[PDB]
Design a protein around this ligand. Structure first.
Ligand SMILES: Nc1ncnc2c1ncn2[C@@H]1O[C@H](CSCC[C@H](N)C(=O)O)[C@@H](O)[C@H]1O
Ligand SMILES: [Ca+2]
Ligand code: NA
Length: 373
């Protein structure tokens, strides 16, 4: 039943040109920048666009339920859309009002990214409950740097720590062989939905419940790898979330795990694309110093694209707020002092550098290249 409901959702999105509507609303100079475009802060302007520039047409009513959560009167939905709305309510992907007279948003927000149609966790952009599936601008910038024209239909690709599935689904635009992995129940259920929503199935995209270190140890070899792993370092004693908290003393343990196995897991000449918000000093991120061992030790070419720089002081608030909300802590806990001390003493973080890293084995021009503006 869920698979049929997603097929009917796909049909609706095609019928009313969802991806084109989304692309027009956000425009080409924002579409690939961030998924945080339609949010609680911009929803009223989205509604005004549908009401005034699209004339309030009923064929777009269900679409707005999915995009912003806006209510639509059940009886005002066109007949085909109405039955689909009922199926989405049954699936928990939309809500009905208590009297059943309207349909509105649940916890899933419909966006488009990199040519794919994607349900994401609505709580990241709306409302006040902590989200359970991550997506963000780092997700996008990882994909931005992939040279799509170099992907062959027979290339074997893996998206580790797939989350919503965005990177795996992007790769599936080009290759017929994609593996997508995660260990969280909630993201695994969501990438199943998003795979079907883009007319993929197990014939070209495998979804696997598997720890990233277990995939990295395995004998499967890949031509292309993507991974946006948990990479944030929180002070000792604080609980984070599955998608946020990195391993190791400085949160970069998973990045180390991946990089160390790339000479074995990648076929010769294969490429990995990673992204992380990396601690550093004024010169650059500390992690890049660890990568010279891969240039010399394995002849790799490693390119680091630094696309955002923030002083560590500008992250104290966001980190502290996230920790307070995730664990349900009260407002008299001095989290900010703990974060500041941890940044200074353990991370040596004067700055955070949002960095996409491309790593290629068996490079003809080996070396480390760090790009900063
Ligand atoms: N040890 C592990 N092995 C595999 N997946 C893991 C993992 N630890 C955390 N995860 C998953 O790692 C993901 C990190 S968030 C990145 C999601 C997505 N690739 C994007 O770029 O938007 C989460 O979905 C989380 O569930
Ligand atoms: Ca706009
Ligand atoms: Na991450």
């Amino acid at each position: 039943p869920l698979a049929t409901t997603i097929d009917r959702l796909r049909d609706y999105l095609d019928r009313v040109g969802f991806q084109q509507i989304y692309k027009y609303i956000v425009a080409v100079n924002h579409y690939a920048v961030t998924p945080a475009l339609i949010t609680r802060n911009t929803a009223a302007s989205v509604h005004h666009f549908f009401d005034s520039r699209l004339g309030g047409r009923a064929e777009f009513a269900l679409l707005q339920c999915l995009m912003t959560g806006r209510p639509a009167e059940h009886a005002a939905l066109p007949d085909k859309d109405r039955a689909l709305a009922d199926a989405l309510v049954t699936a928990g992907l939309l809500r009905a009002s208590p009297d059943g007279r309207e349909v509105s948003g649940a916890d899933r927000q419909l966006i488009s990214a990199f040519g794919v149609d994607l349900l994401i966790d609505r709580r990241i952009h709306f409302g006040g409950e902590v989200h359970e599936v991550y997506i963000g601008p780092d997700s996008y910038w990882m994909l931005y740097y992939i040279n799509a024209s170099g992907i062959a239909r027979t290339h074997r690709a893996v998206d580790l720590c797939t989350g919503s599935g965005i990177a795996a689904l992007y790769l599936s635009l080009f290759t017929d062989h994609v593996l997508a992995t995660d260990i969280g129940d909630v993201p695994l259920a969501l990438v199943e939905i998003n795979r079907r929503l883009n007319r993929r199935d197990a014939g070209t995209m495998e979804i696997r419940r598997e720890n990233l270190n277990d995939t990295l140890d395995g004998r499967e070899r890949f031509d292309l790898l993507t991974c946006n792993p948990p990479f944030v370092a929180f002070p000792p004693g604080y609980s984070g979330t599955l998608y946020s908290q990195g391993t190791g003393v400085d949160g970069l343990g998973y990045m180390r795990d991946i990089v160390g196995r790339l000479p074995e897991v990648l076929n010769p000449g294969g490429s990995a694309y990673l992204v992380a918000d990396l601690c550093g000093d004024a010169h650059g991120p500390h992690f890049l110093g660890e990568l010279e061992s891969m240039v010399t030790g394995h002849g790799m070419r490693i390119e680091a694209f630094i696309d955002h720089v923030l002083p560590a002081s500008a992250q104290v608030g966001p980190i502290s707020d996230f920790l307070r909300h995730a664990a349900g802590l009260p407002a008299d806990t001095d989290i900010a002092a703990d974060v500041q001390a941890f940044q200074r003493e353990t991370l040596r973080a004067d700055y955070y550098y949002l960095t996409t890293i491309r790593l290629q084995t068996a490079a003809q021009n080996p070396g480390l290249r760090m790009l900063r503006r």
